[PDB]
């Protein structure tokens, strides 16, 4: 329903989910007093009634267009939204987009945060579909570029990320020194009265994970003043090169070209989450 391994090529991120029926009960307790506990029970209830028009999966490129209304250039945030409504398996995935983002905006309000639900699954190596479902294969630990893809004609697979979520920290701080580079998932929260945004970022850095929250103070202290958790991050993997290598192309997702940052030679090592109240 939500993710489509058919439309999205081999070499994308995958995010697993929890079980959905714990959502309408945990919103009744973790909510601060003065908020709507019965918002998540009805916003998620209108996605089961929208995806029918159970720990499933949500791929990465599907998740970008849902949080696209809170990214600044916004030209390529709408390019992600262009190829989803036309290529994903499912009738009116764009109706699911304005529902699943409404599910995501119901997460932050009901205090059941979306970082406590999303789980890193491996990168795409192969997938076998059928009616209503697919057998997705991935790499929960290891490198990317040498996997038995399944097709021995093309036993290669490179990691692709759209350019609205890719955030460097080496160029923004004039850190031109070489070395191994790390990869991080970063969520941003924005807690206001019916003005709540979501954003998904994938940060590349050479910083230690102990020396990361100071950088989240630097860029994302803007939402800290408006918010007491404001960020929640997780490790993703390591570029083992002394010179980490990036590319910037526009791949064709069907008939729509989206600016996509290409990462090269990624060794997957997962990790846990973090709160910063």
């Amino acid at each position: 329903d939500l993710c489509q391994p058919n439309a999205e090529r081999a070499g994308a991120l995958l995010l697993a989910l929890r079980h959905p029926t714990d959502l309408p009960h945990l919103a009744r307790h973790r909510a601060p007093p003065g908020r709507q506990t019965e918002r998540l029970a009805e916003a998620w209830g209108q996605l089961l009634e929208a995806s029918a028009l159970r720990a499933g999966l949500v791929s990465f490129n599907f998740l970008v267009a849902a949080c696209a209304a809170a990214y600044d250039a916004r030209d390529a945030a709408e390019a992600v939204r262009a190829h989803i409504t036309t290529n994903y398996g499912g009738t009116r995935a764009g109706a699911r987009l304005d529902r699943f983002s409404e599910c995501l905006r119901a997460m932050v309000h009901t205090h059941v945060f979306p970082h406590e639900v999303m789980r890193f699954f491996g990168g795409l190596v192969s997938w076998v579909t059928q009616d209503e479902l697919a057998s997705v294969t991935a790499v929960c630990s290891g490198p990317q570029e040498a996997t038995h893809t399944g097709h021995p004609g093309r036993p290669r697979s490179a990691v692709t990320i759209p350019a609205c979520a890719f955030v460097d920290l080496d160029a923004e701080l004039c850190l031109g020194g070489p070395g191994a580079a790390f990869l991080y998932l970063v969520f941003t929260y924005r807690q206001c009265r019916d003005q709540e945004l979501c954003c998904v970022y994938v940060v590349k850095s050479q910083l230690p994970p102990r020396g990361l929250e100071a950088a989240l103070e630097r860029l994302f202290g803007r939402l800290r003043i408006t918010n007491c958790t404001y960020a929640a991050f997780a490790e993703l993997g390591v570029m083992p090169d002394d010179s980490p290598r990036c590319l910037h192309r526009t791949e064709r997702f069907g008939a729509v070209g989206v600016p996509v940052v290409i990462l090269e030679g990624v060794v997957w090592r997962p990790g846990g989450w973090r709160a910063c109240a």
Binding site: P33, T37, A180, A275
Partner: protein, 308 residues
């Protein structure tokens, strides 16, 4: 092997007198801080000359703060041309067994995590100086972590006294004192800021439900020997309840659907339970000797397993 070890290589320069060469082979398992995870470096990037800030040498309390901006690597073999070191933060070995060395005067037990600390002790600040290269080397000190949580706790607490003794420890019956030294007031303000942010965030609306239970404790430490041995001779709560009778607000804002104490514990762990790691650095290493003994003594190598 690329994923299993990561043999970062510090290059040794050319002109080295054979005494200064024989000094580095005596530094077989030591701790070396890397600024990056490059495979090609030089001793100038490791040594104390790369460690000094603009114009000002850092004191011991700042010497912690520029450790945690770097990469602790353990030297594994000192070749005649270069130095091979493996960073801890990636992954230790194929089999995962590195030999460290207790520079401390404190023995280790098996299963003790190992947090490392600058040369804080008296009669201990031993820097291997290469006079043919003009390089000193501050090799830090591995410790058992309840010393390394208490040693950093003495240095912050002495720093707040200078904004207006404490320098004596004990560990396994051994009296050891640390170096009393002047402190940079710029560095102590960073540690002072990290307390006030982390302690206030651990205060929640459920904590005033807990503070009503202080006269229960002093009524209880008169009965248990356990709680009487728990509070201390030097506690504050025994003083701030004989002057203070607290009481709670009787009803809470929507106190039935939400749990006021449960959120106080979770907020407390995320800010005060974390707090020993925020001041010092992390114990990424513990001791699992295979067949020798429970205790690796001082000066002797100890095998190392990776540790969260």
């Amino acid at each position: 092997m690329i994923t299993d070890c990561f043999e970062a290589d510090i290059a040794i320069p050319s002109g080295i007198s054979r005494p200064d060469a024989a000094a580095l082979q005596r530094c077989e398992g030591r701790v070396v801080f890397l600024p990056t995870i490059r495979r090609q470096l030089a001793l100038a990037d490791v040594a104390h000359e790369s460690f000094v800030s603009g114009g000002v040498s850092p004191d011991t309390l700042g010497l912690l703060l520029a450790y945690r901006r770097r990469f602790p690597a353990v030297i594994t073999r000192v070749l005649p041309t270069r130095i091979v070191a493996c960073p801890v933060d990636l992954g230790l070995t194929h089999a995962g067994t590195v030999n460290l060395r207790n520079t401390s005067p404190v023995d280790l037990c098996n299963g003790d995590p190992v947090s490392l600390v600058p040369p804080v002790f008296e009669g201990q600040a031993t820097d291997v100086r290469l006079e043919s290269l003009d390089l000193t080397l501050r090799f830090p000190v591995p410790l058992p972590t309840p010393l390394a949580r208490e040693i950093v706790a003495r240095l912050v607490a002495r720093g707040i006294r200078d904004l207006n003794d404490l320098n004596v420890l004990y560990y396994n019956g051994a009296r050891l004192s640390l170096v009393a030294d002047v402190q940079q007031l710029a560095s102590v303000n960073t540690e002072l800021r990290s307390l006030v942010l982390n302690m206030v965030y651990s205060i929640t609306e459920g904590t005033t439900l807990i503070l009503t239970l202080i006269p229960r404790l002093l009524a209880l430490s008169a009965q248990d020997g356990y709680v009487n041995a728990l509070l201390q001779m030097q506690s504050v709560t025994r003083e701030a309840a004989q002057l203070i009778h607290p009481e709670a607000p009787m009803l809470m804002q929507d106190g039935e659907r939400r749990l006021p104490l449960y959120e106080a514990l979770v907020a407390w762990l995320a800010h005060a339970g974390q707090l020993g790691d925020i001041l010092a650095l992390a114990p990424a290493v513990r001791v699992c000797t295979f067949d020798g003994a429970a205790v690796v003594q001082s000066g002797d190598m100890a095998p190392v397993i990776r540790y969260p």
